[model samples]
Target: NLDIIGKRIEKIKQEHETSWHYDQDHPYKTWAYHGSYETKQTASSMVNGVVRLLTKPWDIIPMVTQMAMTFKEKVDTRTQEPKEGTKKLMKITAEWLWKELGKKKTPRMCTREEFTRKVRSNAALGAIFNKWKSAREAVEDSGFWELVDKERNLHLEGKCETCVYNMMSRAIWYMWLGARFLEFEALGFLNEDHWFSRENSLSGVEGEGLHKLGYILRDVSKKEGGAMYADDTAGWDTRITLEDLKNEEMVTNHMEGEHKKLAEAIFKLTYQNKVVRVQRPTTVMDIISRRDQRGSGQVVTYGLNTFTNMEAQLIRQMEGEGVFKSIQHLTVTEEIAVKNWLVRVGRERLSRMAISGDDCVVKPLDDRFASALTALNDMGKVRKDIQQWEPSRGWNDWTQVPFCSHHFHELIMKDGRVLVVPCRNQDELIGRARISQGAGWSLRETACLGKSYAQMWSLMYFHRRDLRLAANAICSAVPSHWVPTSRTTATHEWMTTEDMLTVWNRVWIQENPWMEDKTPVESWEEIPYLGKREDQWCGSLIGLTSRATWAKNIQTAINQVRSLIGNEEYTDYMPSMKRFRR
Candidate 1:
């Protein structure tokens, strides 16, 4: 019962703020209690007990009630009859009685004669008497009336604590339900269907009320059985009592009131470090497949420190410890540190980077990203803490809990083939391309380099020296599936490296690119469609089909693509490929 009240107190603390006030002078002042209690005293006593339990003296808070005194006069006084007072009182009383008797006696006699005649003629009184008698017998036979008699007896003997508690608990629930109904009627914020739906309604209030009732029941049982801490812990939950209901007042305001008290009780009963076991897969194939190999060896261990009402802090601490362990174990070898750092840097940079206009820059990641990384890093470190934390299988089928980037790197390095890393935007499309490329098939030869049918077409961006042939090849190669060719028939001046890179990074290779205009310098221009200019290296080319290709000079093309892919590709592509030395 104590525990139940404690839970309700916790609820009340959560729902309403302590020290909440009301102004009697305000209109609609009768809403103070909102009919939650029969009287102001009842409301105040419960509020005060819960508030004091939650807050210190003189603590200021918001007004939870609007008014407090509308019907005070009607509720305060009761009636009393005057006894005989002699002299003028006797004369007035005698005169009043004389007038009453003189005026009504004749009518009273006639009315009685009419009632006697009807009763004898119809015999309705006998039928009504018999019906009343049968009803009484049926009620007694069902034992419902007996139960009521027992209830009355219990009240007299002061043994009706359980009955009173259950009734009062029910009353509290109706109060909450009534309040919610009133709130809906007054506000009408939600649609009628939504307002009535169980999902959106105030279920918390009912749950809390019932929980308090349970505690009240337990309290009453304990009183009958005898009070002892050990016994109380075991059976206190079974009794329902008035005192228990009183205790439940704390729960009436759980959010603000009973949380501290109940939390204290829980902490006293339970205290220890917690352990959680997470499974690690036994092979690289299993990792990609998202399958956990069965048996004991696949499992890994982790530890957590819990504090009452502070799960966030507990989780944070556990993660911090895991990170520390990861750092410690990882520092044992340089390879491990390099791998960890690379993954950390890659994911951070890749996920954060975004294209705006013509520029490539980092976009701010949300908290979920950091929290996820923190969790993974923490789990990885915790695995190192347990004794003999090795996989059951031999080296040929060994399992290792690799970090996110390490797993990625493994996929890239696998199967005797070089994987083309697509920038973030075209993940799914380019992933398919890599799969195709790994099978020794030319993605371009398969008519898969442009338009919607093309898996991807951005390799030229990173491999900038091939921009002209790449663009011309894509235009000629994917004729039936080309995007720009639908509007323009000819491929004029050769595409510059900058124009190609922009198209790849911001258009073709990216998932959703927003291309904007950019100016290119004369020295950065490509050869014109006409015969070679006198200054061959200084001549420019334009493929102004879109804003991404606007003012795109050949030199500027090489320069911009080199910014991402590196400088080696820039000088190698100018005249011919075989002339370039490694």
Candidate 2:
């Protein structure tokens, strides 16, 4: 039978090697995988060879006997005490040696054999030896009787529930496939108990597996400690309100009695911060069975506790606080369950459900169809609200309207229709609007208005022919004047050919500052020699000279009017014409 089993094991090993395709890319085909096996084999051979002696039938007796003899020899040599008889023997030896060799001899030492023959035969030695023997026998009997008692009581009992349960839990973890028979042994142990006791045991049997599972539950309770459903707040914490208890019921409803208890224990321990211990064996068994039934493709059986707790929190927020009001009235438990089921069932079922469009509208029979429909209807309501929304009525009323003055220029047309046009700076757009309205023109009426105010100003002041020459000539012709009295000033200024000429010149210069280089004067004969040819054109001629010329021309015109009115003495004037020569 041993040979047959060995042969089959060898066959199994060989089958594993050849059953799969062994391409270069294959994981098991690599030297790294095979190297581990070689190391294992080498280690096994070395260890087994050394260990084989311990297993031999006759080897233990010889080894133990040698140890016992060595112990006895050490005891004989090392064991010593002061006694009257031992002192007398030593004194007799010392005297005999001294007599034989006169001050040169030392006292003799007792050899093992001599001591055994002489000292052991004495009554005093016998008393010591018997005491020593009793102590040795007592120590020996203690250890010896323990083994004998164990042997008498030892029955070839089958595996107990504890061992079987441990093996079953380990098997569920996929530790070993052949250990599945232990599950039956566990069941046998359960059967031996009375029905009531069996139920209690199965419900809350604590062991290594159960303890391990308890540790997992504790870890899940603390988010950073390996909980899958851990969120920003560490755990659901106080966020899991009273309404969330519905999710707890949902989770418990799907589970059996023991499973339900285990889940409750986990929930209470985690969420309530309560100390609730659960049976490891039953918990593990339930987890394994649930996972197996779910058909095992990345199934999160452990996370069920965490997810249920989280969903409970979500439900509380929805019902109690009116959060997620759109779908708050729907069965949250059913939605979560269907979602979990869909995830586990995978893409195949989802694909067959005929969900069209990116909206994820599903067929009626599909598990997620109700959730999809709820979401879709909520989105539709939002869309409808958006469509029905109208701009504020006040937006059209001029008095109530709030304009982005920084962006828009206002235009009131002949028909009283106001147009707010988008543009850049507020001051710039306002300036443009003023210019257009003052000119009684629209942007389309003038090419000048079509461009930005800065651009229009640049063209008029720097590029126009008439404005630049007019400004320079005006500055040369004008004479500045001061009023006679501070309290009273003249209503109007007199017009002279000089003032008229200055005005025309100012306009001409402002219109074209660059005109001096370009325009050919009809005659320089009547023109005043303002300055050198280099000084004829000034930078920013229109902007600078136009302002100066207007001020000087007005003052000079006023002074000239006062002279004509026979108030020549009141004319306190400074003539800029003196700077120019004909």
Candidate 3:
């Protein structure tokens, strides 16, 4: 087995064969790697050698035997009034220790002859024995057995949970692995539950491999106080057997064997550490499992180790060739998940769908879309009261009505409440219509004939002695003749219906007593601005008169002279008679 261990170590070194280089022509000139073995062989030898000296074949379990001494020292140090659980644990520990110790030979009382010789010859040993006896007696008198029992019971029932749940999880595995050489070999007494319960234990295994040639396991576990050991197994084993080798040679062979095996294990474990499996979306189980595997697992451990060695021959070779380069590499990734949530309790808190848009410079999915939706919702509210809404194409079309005359026809019924009229150019249109449209009314009316008939009717209504006075007052200021003339030969200024009414009211009705009480005319429609057609004229058989103010004034002058020519029925006033010689 020892030769096999030596061969394993030698094989590990052979396989890696690290040699630093600095050759400019070689691809990996800058790289280096190391092979090392130490520490584990020494500790494993020390522990095994001690156990072999202390026990024989079929002796009580060596670990249990040592544990007794450890427990005894522990109980002896406690000072407080122990609880029931504490007392129980202490008693159990002491009882277990006593049983395991008794499994070995009992110490015999020294014979009187030997005791006197030994005690007188070694006063120091005698004095230590006497003091130890006195202390034992004092402990017995102090009710120590009872105290231990109570404490042992209390510790088992009450205090043990903390020890089991917190401390036992870590310590049990380390103790089991360390005890492998003395008791079981490679059965690995530590189980999966122990490793799972404590995370730091695994981290230690990752950092440093099995030490002491795999005989003594390193207490790589990180907790403060745990099972840690050193063994001298080789010396004790050879001392028991009459081995043919010299002591120096035996020690050297043991070192070679242990260190060699440990080196193989380190190399194998380091290689195993390199290959990794990464977890992803299909296997993202829950929070705890996800937390453990939260990195990309594509690392090459051998290359990493090679790069770490400064003394390798390959590194020096590379340096000599001036091809060596040093580099640091890092990798990072960013991932994110986002969700929206809201609480809904009642009708007043109805749900609303959110709208968002993406921008490149700004963060994606921002709020401007929501604002636009809100503005359109508000516009719908204003549209409800507008019963008649017609949109012109644009401002130019709305302003394009002709000559200020056509726009007044655009009113609509608005829900029986208000009439809405659409106007394009009302101010300009109405002003122009008033001046040009009303001028035709002034040139075509006969006021004198109408007044004379009304006066004749009033004489029949009353028996008045002042008949002439009444007739004279009734028709006295009515114009004596009437004729219509061309509108161009009339007035040059713009004429309005109100302007025509002003002159008509001042002269016709104001001067004629018979027409004084008449009401002003109510309705007028649009007519041509220039003239009336001849066939539409209304008059008597003698030829209807032109009652144009210019024509009518010319006839009135002729009438005054005709009255002087005859008290005659000369019904006509002709322009030819205007040259008469008397």
Give the winner by TM-score: 1
Higher TM-score: candidate 1 or 3?
Answer: 1
By the lDDT metric, which is better: model 1 or model 3? Answer: 1
Error of 3 at 105 (Å): 1.5
lDDT of 1 at 99: 33
Query: What TM-score, computed on C-alpha atoms, does each candidate reach?
Result: 0.18, 0.14, 0.12
Worst window of 10 by summed lDDT in candidate 1: 294-303
What tens digits encode model 2's per-residue C-alpha lDDT throughout 185-289? 111121222211211211111221211222222222232111121111111121222222323223333345433443343233222221111122212111000
Error of 1 at 462 (Å): 3.2
TM-score of 2: 0.14
Looking at candidate 3, the ten consecutive residues that score lowest on lDDT are 353-362
Q: Is candidate 1 or candidate 2 better by lDDT?
A: 2
Candidate-wise lDDT, in order: 0.22, 0.24, 0.20
Off by over 4 Å in 2: 1-238, 245-249, 265-582
The top-ranked prediction according to lDDT is 2
Instruction: Rank the models by lDDT, top first.
Output: 2, 1, 3
